[PDB]
């Protein structure tokens, strides 16, 4: 079972700045701008480039103790970031691997658009839990909004 979902969120931060902060410098912001959702992000292998394995540890009381995202592509010129949840988190009997892509497209009005493409690999003939999709959407939204607030409050951070 391979299931594809697409979302298109918006932001008021310029695309270059938002990619520089939200995607590139996400290890130093997510545990700082949204500590109520992510306890700590740490590259347990690699340094952020392709093949990096980021372990994301959540605070107490969340359903999952940690997730591991295998960073696959980071295109700085087109602001593209392809990673893959491979271990921990929602990946048990049902799921196997969640291939995610985030592309930050600059809008003419000055903001930016996050085009997010997720692809779940359910084992056998299992369905994607709607609660899992909702939780992933909520986590993405809270991280994006927290980074957006960090960039709005600190107008000089990341150019």
């Amino acid at each position: 079972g391979v299931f594809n979902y697409e979302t298109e969120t918006t932001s008021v931060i310029p695309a270059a700045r938002l990619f520089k902060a939200f995607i590139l410098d996400g290890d130093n912001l997510f545990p700082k701008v949204a500590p109520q959702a992510i306890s700590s992000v740490e590259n347990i292998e690699g340094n952020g480039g392709p093949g990096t394995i980021k372990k994301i540890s959540f605070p107490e009381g969340f359903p999952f103790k940690y997730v591991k995202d295998r960073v696959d592509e980071v295109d700085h010129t087109n602001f593209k970031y392809n990673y893959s949840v491979i271990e921990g988190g929602p990946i048990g009997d049902t799921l196997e691997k969640i291939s995610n892509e985030i592309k930050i497209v600059a809008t003419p009005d000055g903001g930016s658009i996050l085009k997010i493409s997720n692809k779940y690999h359910t084992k056998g003939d299992h369905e994607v839990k709607a609660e899992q999709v909702k939780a992933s959407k909520e986590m993405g939204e809270t991280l994006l909004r927290a980074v957006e607030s960090y960039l709005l409050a600190h107008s000089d951070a990341y150019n």
Partner: antibody
Amino acid sequence: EVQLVESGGDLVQPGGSLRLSCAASGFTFSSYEMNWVRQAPGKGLEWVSFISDSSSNIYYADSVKGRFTISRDNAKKSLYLQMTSLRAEDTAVYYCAREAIGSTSFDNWGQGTLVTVSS
Amino acid sequence: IVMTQSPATLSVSPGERATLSCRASQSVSSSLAWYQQKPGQAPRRLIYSASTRATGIPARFSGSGSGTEFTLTISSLQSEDFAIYYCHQYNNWPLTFGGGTKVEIKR
């Protein structure tokens, strides 16, 4: 640079067997989902099959279910398609497409080999 | 899912905007791709997720739409964009392509 090359398709009678192999270099193979896309000589593209990376989530076209069998070898960085019980309408140029991570769309394609089936 | 492209051929002059349509049997998602096959080469992915452009694709290509109606618009149709364009439904299996509208030169 991401690049995929295909093995080759020789003349085969309607009922023969081929094994199209695709060598991929320039990207890590064990994290991408591979696909075979045929294009008949004069028709549009037609998806043939699909293989995942880890558990090999195999998907086949409706017209091609028990005749073909797609497999992969991440150690050899190769993608194989064993075509058995070919018919006259299986003649086509076969492309070794690679799906982008997220959204299963073939961002990079191979050059394709003209598998021709006739008597 | 029978994936259909309405204007099976398109004769528009170089520079004039072209609008390529593609309908679906049932509402799939925003999940649809637009590939460009020049006469002989392998197809080159222009659009995925029905709005997103692939890296290296010129900005004159713009995908839009959802449900059972998708449009690929080329604003400044240059001389290298005369090819065949296929729309791909990857929401559910088996995957299906479109008929393929041939964008040709207007004379």
